[PDB]
Subunit: 388 residues, 4 copies
Amino acid sequence: VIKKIALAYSGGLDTSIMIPWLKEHYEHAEVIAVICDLGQQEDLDAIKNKALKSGASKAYVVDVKNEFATQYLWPLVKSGALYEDQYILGTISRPLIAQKLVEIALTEQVNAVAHGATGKGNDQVRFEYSIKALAPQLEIIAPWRTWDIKSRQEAIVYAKAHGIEVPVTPKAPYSRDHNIWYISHEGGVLEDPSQEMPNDVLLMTAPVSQTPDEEEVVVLDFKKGVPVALNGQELSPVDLLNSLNQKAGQHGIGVADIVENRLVGMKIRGIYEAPAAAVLYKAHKLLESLCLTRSTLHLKQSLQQTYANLVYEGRWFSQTKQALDAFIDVTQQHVTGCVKLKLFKGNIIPAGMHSPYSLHHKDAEGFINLFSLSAKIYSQVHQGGNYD
Amino acid sequence: VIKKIALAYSGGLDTSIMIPWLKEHYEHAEVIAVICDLGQQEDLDAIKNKALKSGASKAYVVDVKNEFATQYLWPLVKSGALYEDQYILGTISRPLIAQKLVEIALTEQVNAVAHGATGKGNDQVRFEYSIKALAPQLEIIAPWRTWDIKSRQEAIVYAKAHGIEVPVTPKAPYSRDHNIWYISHEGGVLEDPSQEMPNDVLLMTAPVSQTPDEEEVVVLDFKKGVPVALNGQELSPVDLLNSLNQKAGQHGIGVADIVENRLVGMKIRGIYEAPAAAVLYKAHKLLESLCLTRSTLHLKQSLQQTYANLVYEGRWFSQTKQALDAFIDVTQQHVTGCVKLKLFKGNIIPAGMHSPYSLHHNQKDAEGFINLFSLSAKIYSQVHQGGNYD
Amino acid sequence: VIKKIALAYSGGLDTSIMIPWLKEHYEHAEVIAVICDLGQQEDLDAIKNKALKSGASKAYVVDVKNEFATQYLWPLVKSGALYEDQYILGTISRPLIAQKLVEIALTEQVNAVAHGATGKGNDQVRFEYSIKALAPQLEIIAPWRTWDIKSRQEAIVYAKAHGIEVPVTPKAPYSRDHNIWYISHEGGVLEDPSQEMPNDVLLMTAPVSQTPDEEEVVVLDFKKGVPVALNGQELSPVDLLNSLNQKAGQHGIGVADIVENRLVGMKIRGIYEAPAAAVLYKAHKLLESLCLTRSTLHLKQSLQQTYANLVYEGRWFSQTKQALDAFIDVTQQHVTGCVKLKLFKGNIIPAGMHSPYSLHHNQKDAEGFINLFSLSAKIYSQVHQGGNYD
Amino acid sequence: KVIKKIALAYSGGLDTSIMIPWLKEHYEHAEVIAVICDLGQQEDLDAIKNKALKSGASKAYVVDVKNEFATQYLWPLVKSGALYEDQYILGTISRPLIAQKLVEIALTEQVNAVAHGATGKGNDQVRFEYSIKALAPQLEIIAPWRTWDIKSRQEAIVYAKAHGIEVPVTPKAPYSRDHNIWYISHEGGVLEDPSQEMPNDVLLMTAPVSQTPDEEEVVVLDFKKGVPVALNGQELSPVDLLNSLNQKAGQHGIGVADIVENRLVGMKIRGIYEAPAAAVLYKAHKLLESLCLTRSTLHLKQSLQQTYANLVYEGRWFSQTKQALDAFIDVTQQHVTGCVKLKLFKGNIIPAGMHSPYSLHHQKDAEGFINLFSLSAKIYSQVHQGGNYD
Ligand SMILES: Nc1ncnc2c1ncn2[C@@H]1O[C@H](COP(=O)(O)OP(=O)(O)NP(=O)(O)O)[C@@H](O)[C@H]1O
Ligand SMILES: Nc1ncnc2c1ncn2[C@@H]1O[C@H](COP(=O)(O)OP(=O)(O)NP(=O)(O)O)[C@@H](O)[C@H]1O
Ligand SMILES: Nc1ncnc2c1ncn2[C@@H]1O[C@H](COP(=O)(O)OP(=O)(O)NP(=O)(O)O)[C@@H](O)[C@H]1O
Ligand SMILES: Nc1ncnc2c1ncn2[C@@H]1O[C@H](COP(=O)(O)OP(=O)(O)NP(=O)(O)O)[C@@H](O)[C@H]1O
Ligand SMILES: NC(=[NH2+])NCCC[C@H](N)C(=O)O
Ligand SMILES: NC(=[NH2+])NCCC[C@H](N)C(=O)O
Ligand SMILES: NC(=[NH2+])NCCC[C@H](N)C(=O)O
Ligand SMILES: NC(=[NH2+])NCCC[C@H](N)C(=O)O
Ligand SMILES: [Mg+2]
Ligand SMILES: [Mg+2]
Ligand SMILES: [Mg+2]
Ligand SMILES: [Mg+2]
């Protein structure tokens, strides 16, 4: 008996019209909106009011920027994971959105939760794996998989029919996602990989041709694998990300133009901006090269893909992830020190690093003989053979 | 009796004095010098003549640039491997040097082979693993592990006592290696990772502040994972690497400043220049992302570290490498197409790609996939009711 | 328009009633049946006649036992793969069934292919992945996912209303699959892992208490990773498997009782009989331990899970599988020799092995190896003075 | 700087007995402290202590480490599920513990050096010395087998007699053995020919299958967080449970492995290993994991078993790499809690039921899952139209 539904509400046209749609298809159902502040830099008061004006009985706005940075982005930094060796995994936000939706749903005695992810992308998997992992008893409603709205023009017609304001502004040329960690752009003319990136895509990163002609030095202090200070100033994760995004963005750093494999089974061409992320990944990699032994570094690097795939596929809320985090946290115990980097014209240039736990500071013949003994034996057995 | 020794001879003071040293410690032994042209851009006829003036009975100069490109660098490009996710592995040349040394050693019926790799580095392992893999019967002599010479001034004293001319110009401030693929710099003041790279290190790459203010477009055509044309012009591998090294180096591309783990058990700070290698790695990665399925891409990426460690450790001549190469060659069958890149201020910027084998092209399907993909998570959370994942 | 359908036909009641059901739901479609002889040891003439009596216009019976052994089981033996470290993967037959279904469909102007795998299992994924990999243009029809028949009694009602004869003998208490490599049992009272295996499950393996009191020696010759002779007699793959299944089954060998993760999201309890497979896996493992270097063995063992998952998931017809097969075939080049084993009371006991390519054959070297192998540990403990590894 | 005191890992053999006078000879006025560990080798340790004192040791410690061997070494090993090269139960996991106790006493006694009696050709010298460097990088290590002029057992006997050490006539053991609560190892002698079956005088704790009981024996194992806590309904300490299970499973002929393994020191060795309780615990642990872990956790954990096994085999126990693996493993073991019933019979460990409070064992969706799971295969086959996967 669906009497009450919690909707992950982003403020767009689509989730706005899902409020009356949900109330139409679940008779006398009350709809509560859940709005997360992830750093998308939108007017959340206006989004809250729009949810209420659209028919929600309540509209929660939850500021999750610090929780996102400390509970999601910091473990990701520690993992060093890049999906398919290229993608900075900004959709790590989806399980956090799901977590807040489920938390509020359970305090509001709702029967079902809903989200506005489309029927063709990855985000629907991320949302629904997370919801099942957190609250297997909650019904999930995905209007894009059910309703007859097929186009933006149809959504606009429906919006006007239900008193939802639709002012004229052209269709966005690109489908975008924005949080404190990244900006993603896909769709439209981007879906043709034979074409270069158009010049109106980037939103927070300067094209290299307009970057400063003087390099900028940044000094990052890390403790146990995460950054705690910038240029000698202790900063919260959010403040450090904000400052580093501004600096590295001004210097054109961090743009990735990639073709990736979706979980749903097709390839997509995406543009990703993440200036601070690129700088943090570089500094973290340098410190690990100083502070981990060879065997630890090699084993940890061999698990980056596993971690990246888990994040990409929405499997954050799993024992598998818990076990990887426990492995990673051990490896990060001594990843503590100072990394100086020069930002300049899209480049992150090493400028020195140090750590109180730096490992940088007749035997050879015996090592060589025993290291190569199996090769010597093999070649004696296969005399005259080659390795072609 | 050791009557004949083949020496891998690079032309420095050290391998020059190894010639009388070997003749002294192996009485009446004749020494044959083997010099490889790997693209180090040195006067090899001068090096040949110095080998003979130093007491070598014969001095071979073998031009192996083409074979280095096709038999080593092209498999490396196909692998996509980077040691510790950073190093472009220019010492992939060491097994080739060992291969030419052994080939000549067997032709000349020598009793032993010798090399001048130092006793503290990786190159001695690379040479000696390769020699044992190719010719386990040959004795190996490494003078740096046997002789009493410890410093350059000690080598100079020895050279004077043994009729070896000492070059006027001193040893560079850095230990360097140079071939068509890369230039490496280590040692000296580079052994302090707390300092930035000095301004006198780079030899083939412009500093980014001194790069052109206009971008340059390059177009690379690939066939089965390797580049066959640049800007619409079919080029041999060596000509293509040469051209791309010039273009990308002019635009400041490809400098790596890293701390790596040696095989011999300690970390070293190195500077690596490899402009064309960076451009080819980028283009190859882009084309794989278009032409491989997800499962093939993910499996191949998971073997890159294995390949990189094998190359770094000198294990090129092994059945393990042969098996990896067979796997890689299958995955490269359709990595064929065109990649356009912009070179600019140290950046390699995607400018479009296409492939006749590109794999890039209902709502009811998604709900079923979601439910079964997530079923195990739903069962787990029902069993551990109320549990967190903290 | 779907005018003609090829149905993978096993001869049970369910695939029999699918023939009239397909004709009802695809207006006047012709249905041809494809029956594979995989070693299920059934009366294939009776199955062929039952397909025709049920309304099939044609019923092909294809003997695929040699193709199965040489093109599927031999690569599997070479891989050493066991799904979740326990399961011998007898459903490697499903891509072969799909391959014959498609081969015949494309000689018969067929528009759609059909199979009788249930909607809850793995086999439907295996069939339909394979069909899409081989012939993406063919439509696929799975009646269990579409029709309203939900029980055996409902199937019987439907058979009676459509002229399909109902067998006198009931449904077996277990869902079974049988080919030359294995017999699988699941469902029924087996779906309680808290209970031991009932005494009426096993079909080709003696209970251990009912095995001979004298051991039996078998001698297996291998060439390039696959068995070519048994007790000094060269035997075809099918004859060797048949003989070894009889011998090892009589000695109680090869029963696995496991809980496995399905691809479709849930765990299942299965009983698997595969006597010859257990013996061949053991002999192959022993010879690899003799003929492979350490690095090759370790790398190959690290890919067994990948291969096992690929087979289990039905991804046989993929470039990923082709690349793995290329890797594996290199590693098998020297896996050639003789393994003697004692079969006794459910045990496979090594009794000696040899190979012309066996790799089994100073104190000063050890100290240097130890010091450099341990140098990284010494540096770390000097840096972290007073620490522990708790 | 002058070596005044040496701590020696002292086993009671002839070899470490004569190392006390040898050490005192080669390090003038040095005293020798013997360190004897109780690992379950079932020897008279007070007699070994007395022999050390009689041979000239100033102090002789006997450290009972059986409980901590089980809880700090064997229990993590059981939780890992690791087998070296998929065959070896890793009984030399004891070597880092021996080194740890040696180093503790070394530091307490303010000695200048530690010594051990491992030979120059084996793995144990690496295990001891890696551990010693990881725990105490400042301590000098003395390995007399790598230094002294004693080459044979007969020479060791001559030396013992010239230095007052009792050598009564008792013939050379035909095999080199190691024994602790976890396993017994046998190698050397006629075992070094893999073409020969195991001789009938090898086994010491495991019945040959032909003399095992004719009635099966049920054991019930309760596990909590991946380790056994009770046997047949009785809570037992780890040592008591291992002792009881070794007796029961040994009586039923369980757990003998006859293998060829790759040494770290670069060559293969043929070994016989007995470990009855270990085989039973490994089987029970594997069954419980199959019930309680999700598929993705099981697959990832199984993929790290080889890493863990190699680390243990190579002596790298005292490392951050091991600590990180243990942290991963411990998370996966949090719900590996429940009851496994097994039948021991004639060398077989037969599943007889399992249950757990955390067991994970309990039409339209399947089509959508199939279509998206197989979409990349369909796209690939449309691009490579009509292609094959041979
Ligand atoms: N900050 C957020 N708070 C709550 N729900 C969110 C948030 N961001 C995304 N979602 C949910 O995730 C779904 C998918 O995100 P998204 O791709 O941004 O679509 P959209 O916001 O509906 N459309 P658009 O205007 O093009 O961005 C949304 O429909 C919401 O259900
Ligand atoms: N092109 C080459 N041809 C033949 N042998 C070579 C070549 N390059 C390197 N070697 C061998 O490898 C050894 C190690 O190389 P390297 O570190 O360059 O030492 P080096 O040339 O003797 N000294 P330096 O002058 O400081 O570069 C050399 O001594 C030679 O034995
Ligand atoms: N040897 C075979 N030849 C052709 N098709 C087969 C063969 N084995 C299995 N199949 C197909 O695979 C499907 C699933 O196999 P299976 O689980 O045995 O179902 P079934 O045979 O229809 N029912 P049952 O009588 O309980 O064995 C069958 O319905 C057929 O479509
Ligand atoms: N329980 C133990 N306590 C102390 N040291 C030990 C113990 N077991 C082994 N060691 C050390 O490990 C070394 C190698 O073990 P091992 O192979 O048993 O040689 P051994 O005891 O000297 N000779 P053997 O009588 O043939 O077993 C010994 O020489 C000791 O230094
Ligand atoms: N709803 C969105 N626009 N999401 C951005 C998707 C980014 C990227 N393709 C991913 O799947 O992680
Ligand atoms: N002799 C030399 N300078 N060799 C260059 C070594 C570069 C790098 N450290 C490597 O081991 O591959
Ligand atoms: N239709 C059948 N009876 N199939 C046998 C299934 C065996 C095993 N569970 C597997 O998926 O491989
Ligand atoms: N000293 C001994 N006898 N040790 C037994 C060695 C067992 C096995 N070969 C190993 O290296 O682990
Ligand atoms: Mg949005
Ligand atoms: Mg040189
Ligand atoms: Mg059947
Ligand atoms: Mg002993």
